């Protein structure tokens, strides 16, 4: 319940709080959602402030005692020790300056406990602006989410689907097109399709990384780098790559584009949206395959967590959320003006949530649904044995003309190809029953 002094009056701040007057003013200004920055965003702000202090110390602009104090305080923030010291709403000034100042104030308070006096702006914000910091922290967090978390979760799900594609390679069943009975396929072939969708999703995320990983740091207020060293960005990026192991981080190709727009977030959200579209098809097919057991398809059994398909439901709900988040991201992305896009906090919340939801639900889907599925093999074969057949595989035995007459008579009389052959008296020296049954065999028709 302490009291601090701002250039517009008094400011009451909780006693255990490491934040100062500017953060408290932002708390009072933006009571909108009641939610603040996520752990990933706080970590990236800590990483960035430590790297900037490191580079300011290397260039001789910041006394080594002050840099050491910022570096140690920043490492605690990056390590998750101060996730309760960031109370500002997501829906704040659209540069994210409020959160940038929150980080400067918390580092100054941590340093003061260790006996060092730091000015939040002149020391902790040295060579930085109110406008190049929060977007840099956003792109660090998004690139870490893509590379360290989403891609491995998607690979786990790909591997689970591919393992079923191989197990079920000869588990024949009926194909369905337009929801209507079609020629045979295998359950393994369908899973090979699901696995390719997830592999393509990993390709889509990898394709966005050259632009997602672009950082604005060094551009300062408008992109020109005024009041920063000319090589500030390239030096800070090198420290961040070294500390995180994220080789995908890079300086911006164009310092104006990197601050006037957040196009890299819009691009990345489109990859995540495409993954949500793929996951919707996979999850829907799996719940339909497990439907019933008397009123539905009853092709597979899902693991029980009459089992309701609770992980397909979680997957499809997550996909809906990614689709909505993606619309919010593109709306903010389009609406920048001149030197700055002022939708960064909202865009950051949405893209980081989409990464988190897809990573977590993919791992759960892989481990607690896909890996445990069991096929109802005898039921699936009975469905394959009820698919339509074709005459083509009889051509070499009865010739193009008799085959065509079998096709026509089967259609007219609503008979199978097999029975129409028997009924036309075609079993003989040209065609044994055995040869009929081998030519029309449903696993052979699946071409597995």
């Amino acid at each position: 319940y302490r009291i601090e002094h701002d250039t517009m009056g008094e400011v009451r701040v909780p006693a255990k709080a490491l934040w100062r007057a500017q953060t408290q003013r932002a708390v009072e200004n933006f009571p909108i959602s009641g939610r603040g920055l996520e752990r990933t965003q706080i970590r990236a702000l800590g990483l960035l402030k430590g790297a900037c202090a490191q580079v300011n110390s290397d260039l001789g602009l910041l006394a080594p005692e002050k840099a050491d104090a910022i570096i140690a305080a920043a490492a605690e923030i990056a390590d998750g020790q101060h996730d309760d010291q960031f109370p500002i709403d997501v829906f704040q000034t659209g540069s994210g300056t409020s959160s940038n100042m929150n980080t400067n104030e918390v580092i100054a308070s941590i340093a003061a406990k260790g006996g060092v006096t730091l000015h939040p702006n002149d020391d902790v914000n040295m060579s930085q602006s109110s406008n190049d910091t929060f977007p840099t922290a956003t792109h660090i967090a998004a690139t870490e989410a893509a590379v360290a978390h989403l891609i491995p979760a998607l690979q786990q799900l790909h591997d689970a689907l591919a393992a079923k594609a191989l197990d079920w390679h000869t588990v024949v069943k009926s194909g369905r097109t337009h929801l209507m009975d079609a020629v045979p396929v295998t359950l393994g072939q369908e899973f090979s399709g699901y696995a390719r969708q997830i592999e393509a999703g990993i390709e889509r995320v990898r394709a966005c990384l050259p632009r997602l990983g672009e950082l604005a740091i060094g551009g300062t207020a408008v992109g020109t780098g005024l009041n920063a060293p000319d090589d500030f960005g390239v030096r800070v990026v090198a420290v961040l790559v070294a500390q995180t192991g994220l080789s995908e981080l890079r300086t911006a190709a164009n310092s104006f584009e990197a601050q006037a727009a957040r196009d890299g977030l819009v691009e990345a959200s489109g990859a995540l949206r495409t993954i949500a579209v793929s996951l919707t098809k996979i999850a829907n097919d799996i719940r339909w395959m497990g439907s019933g057991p008397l009123t539905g398809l009853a092709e597979i059994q899902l693991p029980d967590l009459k089992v309701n398909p609770v992980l397909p439901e979680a997957v499809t709900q997550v996909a809906a959320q990614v689709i909505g988040n993606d619309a919010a991201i593109a709306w903010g992305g389009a609406n920048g003006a001149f030197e700055l896009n002022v939708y960064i906090p909202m865009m950051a919340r949405n893209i980081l949530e989409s990464f988190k939801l897809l990573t977590n639900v993919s791992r759960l889907f892989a481990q607690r649904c896909i890996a445990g599925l069991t096929a109802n093999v005898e039921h699936l074969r009975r469905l394959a044995e009820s698919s339509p057949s074709i005459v083509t595989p009889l051509n070499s035995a009865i010739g193009y003309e008799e085959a065509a007459a079998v096709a026509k008579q089967a259609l007219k009389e609503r008979k199978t190809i097999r029975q129409t052959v028997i009924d036309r008296g075609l079993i003989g020296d040209r065609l044994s029953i055995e040869d009929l049954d081998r030519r029309l065999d449903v696993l052979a028709m699946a071409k597995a």
Copy 2:
């Protein structure tokens, strides 16, 4: 770190948790977002369980000591005393069964501390199913959010915009179409338009209430009411109306439509999305009018909250973007129901209830901390209106369109009023008196304000 024995083995539950084994299993099943139900959600689940116990008591199905214990526990939940006892992810089974069971378990644990044993399922879930309760609670929460919170916040913003319209009635300035200079308006007329956008917003929310207030309660598992009293729904709705004062709550017109779809939430999100569209235009015009102080429009000054940056217009346009995204998620969930149940309810509820909250909170902040304190550069706005080439048309009948165009070009080049330019070019004479000039160039008259 207390222990519990489930149907399927052992479960460890935190010591001070009031939830039980089925909630803890859902915590383990759905570690997806790390975000659970919001306060409004949780309150409505308490309201619903209290009303259900009241009705089961009234019908002689539930012993009164048990009903009384449920009603007392449910009132604590409705009063927001147990918002920390609902740990299940939003991204759970799509009926919201897990959160329904979370409510039943917390009520049983609260009751147990007052010395009354309740079975979560057989007592707290009596006459209810796993499918008619969560969407009922969602529609209670959304109807309360609309009536009690968003409409009053929009009315505050409307009244702030209308007050500025009246204060700025005669504040004449150049009109802008296509971003280019146009004939005069007043700042008051522009604010009267903003006020109408917000008043139409309230009309849009009021128009969705007949269907937003429809509750599925009493439909049970598939909408038929099997295993519930025939009049359970109308009885529970009547208790909710009596307790809350929300007369907009009603039984559903069709019990199958009320469980197979969530179309009322999709409809209400469309009203919220329209309000977000209106707020985007109002907030964008206000930040543009405050742009400068040298190279921008410099029409008005915003109050300084943090040369003021337009931080509340930025909060408002960010909220609007979130409402538009949330709206897309809601419609996606709404379209994808199957047969007797739409299984996107927890995701739809998160998104609709967030949209109500953000619009309510940001509308009040925008009204109080931005709109109320705007100041206009009155004399500057009038000087620009009086200096615009757009106002030479009323001279054409005195001096011709060719001389009126030379006046417009010289006024702009020399940074002079049209009036001073007409005088400087020696046009005052028999053709045009000083008084006829001041009548033809009366920019406030050109704006046609009441």
Copy 3:
């Protein structure tokens, strides 16, 4: 070809073209989509110009011979006689001024063929501006599309679904929740739900009309009505209402809101988007119910409309549910474009009107046409597989609950387990476990396991 002279220079225009130099310039300026105004928008521009000429005549501002020529020409345009004379891209100047000028030029050319000289701007655009005309025509077209076309088409679909709800009142089947077996319902109850969705859709459209029907006419360039009669809007609206019978048309509540924003189109699109969401659920349930017919649900049969496949010649597909679900996807896309344009107005004018108009009027048209086709070519001819549906209901573990009070919940679970294992009815499994006796008579068993009574039909 024939040549004309614009303020800029010389312009070549097609011989049979009733448009003039401004329209030809717009043709050369915006070769973007290769699609121009639809017939509903052209019709509305004709209605508007005819009403404006009538009022300008009544007020003594326009000579009667000139007003009479504009009225005659504008009636030809409203009657669809000139739908080939509007070549300008949708993607034009955002006020729609190019299309307004196209209308003025075509009316002047029609009048010229009857010996009357009309100035496109000073006569045909009298009392109007480049900014209050196109949004007025857009709202006339959208209101007409809602009231005269979509609501009747939705009522037709509602009536077709409600007729099935009555025909199938006793057709008992298992319910499905989460795609899993549930307690009994009737196919009539499910169709009653579909019907309510469409009835609610009509209520949604009706709820938006007080604001969709607001017209900007009379507000002129900025909303102030400068250079128009003070009562131009109310007089033009009176003529349009009398001539069209569109009682929903009204003068805007606020003349600045009606030009600075297009919020009524955003609102109306939300109703259409909600109808698309409802239609998606209805169409998806119907194609699933008709799936198979050997490997699917096979609950109903859809009328056959065309061959499905050359490789599998017997196969017929649910083509009308597919058309419906594809229309719904288009309406949801159109809705997103409309809200995008609606948010992005500046000051006195929203300059997204041609794009918003294209999208809202297309959503009306697609929903109207597909609703009628779905009602007539799919719903009306559905047939139910009654005995299949009842067999599954009578075999369902879900229906053992009503036995609990006779034999207890544990023995009822054993009946469920055995029946499901042995593919038997519940009735027959109860017998095969000799539970009929003192506790349970055979008439009593048949009363407890009455699956139609469990559906609780009214």
Copy 4:
């Protein structure tokens, strides 16, 4: 009318139409939008039918005389001689069955004029299904639109923006953040940012081509390739690459994914949506720069088509349409079932429209707006030199309090910062003229030379 027939019986068809019974049933079943396939789609179906007949001929499955007749008729269709013979609505059966049969029937009728009897299904549809042909035609049309049309249009717009970036490299002006005055930039720097957004757009389109160019051909009804030669897809793709020169066309990595989903269209629409987002920012900044001529920013003048910013308005309306189309595409993409995604005609309409609108508006914007912009150079510099934002580098010489008084007086008197520092008598005690001109050099402050 004349009588034609199919497996469902007899159908009345317009006496002279080149389509037959299946197309006519589709005319009556789907009168929804009143719009059919676009020129690009009809071209792709013609290309594909010709390539299929070449491969069936090469494998000895189809008589050379019949293959020649198909190839010639398919060439007339691809060239646009028979577009009026494709009457079927976009909103047809979701596999594109109806438009596939339309192509087969029209080819058979054209071949008959030349005295060759072709069966639309046994000959023109040999080794094919609608399930692999209609999505193949859609991905051909989309790949061609990306490579031959949109990337060159974007490169023209990039080059026009980059030409301004160079021309305006020293055109110093006030920076704007939050719409508020900020430290100096140049118009050239802002245009270099717009140019980067369009170059990144080109990178985004190129990044999607490995998947957009995947073709389903050879997968037949369910992806298994039943009723087609095992190498049909690889042979047909080789013919298409030879004929079109589109090396980006390729056989699908997985034949089941290529028919059960249209994820490549969803992916490509995301690139187009991102370009729409970039174009919105560029066009909105340009119309604001041109605003006025008295009460707006008045930084630049747009070419006249007091000019209204009509091409910025066309660009921002096109962008809105691409965003809407992108939502419709993703909705269709998610909703496939089992072996087939049945939203292909609607997804094809939307993604091909987005390609076309972005191509056409990008070239118009480049040639008829960007190329002709003029800057109010001396005005922009005067405002930059008069902004309170540039007083900061004086703080160390005159103090915060006096730098604030300089800013306030400069704004009130409408004078430069340089002239205000002189007027307040700060030269000599605080700093010299040499020092003043170094500290307030706005072009140096923009970090431009």
